[PDB]
Structure 1
């Protein structure tokens, strides 16, 4: 799936994650900005500090940090195209603030940093190395370092409650199946798991903000946008991919509408 395909429905910043409609009247793009600000506004960034963006994407977050918090910034991505893109954007920076993009994984970064931010990308599920991750977050942040993790989470067996659906172990397991195999179709971390993995590597989860409502609308806006470009979509990929996404976007939006799927920002203050 070409990056061109996703550009058919994502906003100009190409943010493939939950948007934050701080205002109901916000556009997908404004919501993505607010989401980024929501994240950043939680790190207590001070001019001169160095921010690490784990999974910088097309760079919207980095640039926003430099702009509103006047800080140096290091971004990591496993996407040649995203690195290329941000690297070009960063070229000839007169700004008295360092801006660096790296085509490496977080497990290969080893630099003193003041604050860490990690906003995941939708279909990128693989939260099975969270323990080692905090160890690294700890091993890089200042004594009062702070990190924000924006991730999709799933319901912990003993975490559900008060939704109006069966409370059995059989129903939970079925939903767990649906969630891991179809919508979204990957293994998701539970809120307890993150709070626990963090509380065991030198961190303390100060806040857990849910953006569940917002994702329903984000996905709603992505599907509408995609449908409006059905022609181009079928032309870049095929009618099979187009349909797959329309129903995968639709299905995932519903999983949030029942709560077995959630998206949280975890302020991890150490």
Structure 2
């Protein structure tokens, strides 16, 4: 009700950044109050309830209404906001000199390091995005056989096209929905960068993925998380505007750092890392600098995409919201609440 006018102000870009950030922190602080429990017994039971609950769901509900609101994004826009590698996920900022572009590379190298990728292997990039990791792995290891899987077509066409121009003869893009796709091939490395947040039955999904791992192969998983608790992105109450601010409810789950430790039926954990929230926070902060600095080019292309001025404005302030959501959320408490998690699995 009284949030209906806040959402409207945010749409019209009336609320300045300082004010936005503080209103967001208020919402985060309320989420921590909600998520943290007085006794560790309860805290653990809340993870046990969510794990058991997801085990009676389908691999992912509402699969490509997610992929037409987001992910079917103009390439030309993502080239403005994202870095050169078009990484649509956490980047890694070692030092403060670290630009967005280096931060992209740093994170991608770390993946290859931590997934233990060697020149002649089959490599599978599930939820490939704009192909940042696929192209990286292809340029880096000439004899690797990379297969990037997406359900989008704007993504598929770009990666295919980009391979050709970068002259990467070892990339293969496969258009499919992973929730229902079955493939009889098998791979030495499987890589999943921030896909699981959109899915539900991690048991069925990891059972499905476990079979695409050849013997002695490995599955590498990045997911954002909270340090301690886990939850569906669903409003706390009548006053929570932040949860559905950017992601439409039902599209998102925020795992605990330990979450997929509870899903080791068909894969077994080998290694586990986490990584400060300040990394994704700066990533978002550089995505935001990128919008605001290129408004002059963004407005006219938004203005033609939405044949309209009623709405070119709402879409630009949507993307600010995205950025400021990630900036403050993962930034919260010097990066020690919401953060990223890296898990390495064998069969």
TM above 0.5: yes
1:213 to 2:278 alignment: yes
Instruction: Tell me: CA distance 1:262–1:73, structure 2 relative to 1, closer, same or farther (3 Å).
Output: same
CA gap of 1:31–1:39, structure 2 versus 1, over 3 A, is same
1:169 is matched with which residue? none
Task: Output one character per residue of 1:24-67: Cα deviation in whole Å (capped at 9) or x when no partner.
Answer: 32221111111111111112223321000012222221222133
Deviation (angstroms), 1:9: 1.2
The farther-off stretch of 74-83 and 255-264 is: 255-264
Specify the alignment match of 2:305 in structure 1. Answer: none
Distance 1:91 1:3 in 2: 17
The CA distance in 2 between the partners of 1:81 and 1:229, in whole Å, is 22
Q: Evaluate the alpha carbon distance shift between residue 179 and residue 51 of structure 1 in structure 2; reply closer, same or farther with a 3 A threshold.
A: farther
Structure-1-length-normalised TM-score: 0.81
2:185 matched to 1:119? Answer: no
Change (3 A) 1:179 1:40: farther
Which of 122, 131, 134 lines up with 1:50 in the alignment?
Answer: 122
User: Per the alignment, do residues 17 and 104 of structure 1 end up closer, same or farther by CA in structure 2, a change over 3 Å counting?
Assistant: same
Distance 1:29 1:195 in 2: 32
Question: What TM-score, normalized by structure 2, do the two folds share?
Answer: 0.64
**Number of equivalenced pairs:** 252
Shift of 1:120: 2.5
Pick the structure with greater CA Rg. 2
Q: Distance in 2 between matches of 1:145 and 1:11?
A: 31
Matched, 1:195 2:266: no
In the TM superposition, 1:1-270 aligns within 5 A as 2-69=74-141, 70-91=143-164, 98-107=170-179, 108-110=181-183, 111-120=185-194, 125-154=197-226, 156-157=228-229, 180-182=243-245, 186-197=252-263, 199-237=264-302, 238-258=312-332, 259-270=336-347
Structure 2, unpaired ranges of 5+: 1-72, 231-235, 303-311
Describe the superposition over 1:64-113 as per-residue Cα deviations: whole angstroms up to 9, x where unpaired: 21333341111111221221122223349987x74211111234141111
Q: Which runs of 5+ in 1 are unaligned?
A: 160-172
CA distance in 1, matches of 2:157, 2:171: 14
SS at match of 2:212: coil
Question: More deviation in 255-264 or 73-82?
Answer: 255-264
Give distance in 2, aligned partners of 1:115 and 1:81: 25
